[PDB]
Paper text:
The 2A protein of Theiler's murine encephalomyelitis virus (TMEV) acts as a switch to stimulate programmed –1 ribosomal frameshifting (PRF) during infection. Secondly, the viral 2A protein is required as a trans-activator of frameshifting in cells and in vitro which permits temporally controlled, variable-efficiency frameshifting related to the amount of 2A protein in the cell during infection. Our previous investigations of protein-stimulated frameshifting in EMCV and TMEV have revealed that the viral 2A protein acts in complex with a stem-loop downstream of the slippery sequence, and that this interaction can be disabled by mutating either a conserved cytosine triplet in the loop or a pair of conserved arginine residues in the protein. Despite highly divergent sequences within cardioviruses, the TMEV 2A protein adopts the second known occurrence of the beta-shell fold.
We crystallised the protein but were unable to solve the structure by molecular replacement using the crystal structure of the closest homologue, EMCV 2A, as a search model. Instead, we obtained experimental phases via bromine derivatisation and determined the structure by single-wavelength anomalous dispersion analysis. In the crystalline lattice these residues mediate contacts between symmetry-related molecules, consistent with recombinant 2A forming trimers at high concentrations. Since tag-derived residues mediate the inter-subunit contacts, the 2A trimerisation interface that we observe in crystallo is unlikely to be physiologically relevant. The structure of TMEV 2A reveals a globular β3αβ3α fold, with a similar ‘beta-shell’ architecture to EMCV 2A (Cα backbone RMSD of 2.65 Å over 130 residues). An extensive curved antiparallel six-stranded beta sheet packs against two alpha helices on the concave surface of the sheet, whilst the loops between adjacent beta strands project from the opposite convex face. Conversely, in TMEV 2A, the α2 helix continues with a pronounced 90° kink until the end of the protein.
Numbering used by the authors: -4 to 126
């Protein structure tokens, strides 16, 4: 396959969303460390419900309990493109994302990119425990 990708500029954030009945956790990571973490009271969700939370939508709640599940949301941007991609479980190169979106916008500074990334879940950030 291709020997590599060489984007002239690349900003990336990996958002790990952990679903449990008691808490849902949002971990924004760069270079393997959280740069922002927040948590909301958990609720039951269907698989489509979890994807909608990953998209930043408000899904219907379910009364049913479930076991812990990890979703991996990847934001990347060049100066002229922005990608939004959602995996059930962790990213793998062989794994098909459950949602993949490409925006013809890009970002020239990381601060603007990070602000744009946060906006996807801003309504959940309003619901955070430590407020
Ligand atoms: Br919090």
């Amino acid at each position: 396959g291709p020997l590599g990708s060489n984007p002239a500029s690349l900003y990336r954030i990996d958002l790990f969303i952990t679903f449990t009945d008691e808490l849902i956790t949002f971990d924004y990571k760069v270079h393997g460390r959280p740069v922002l973490t927040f948590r909301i009271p958990g609720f039951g969700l269907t698989p489509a419900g979890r994807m909608l939370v990953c998209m930043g939508e408000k899904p219907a709640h379910s009364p049913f309990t479930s076991s812990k599940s990890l979703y991996h949301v990847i934001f990347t941007s060049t100066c002229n493109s922005f990608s939004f991609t959602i995996y059930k479980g962790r990213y793998r190169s062989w794994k098909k994302p459950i949602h993949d979106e490409l925006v013809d916008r890009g970002y020239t500074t990381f601060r603007e990119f990070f602000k744009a990334v946060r906006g996807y879940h801003a309504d959940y950030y309003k619901q955070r425990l430590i407020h």
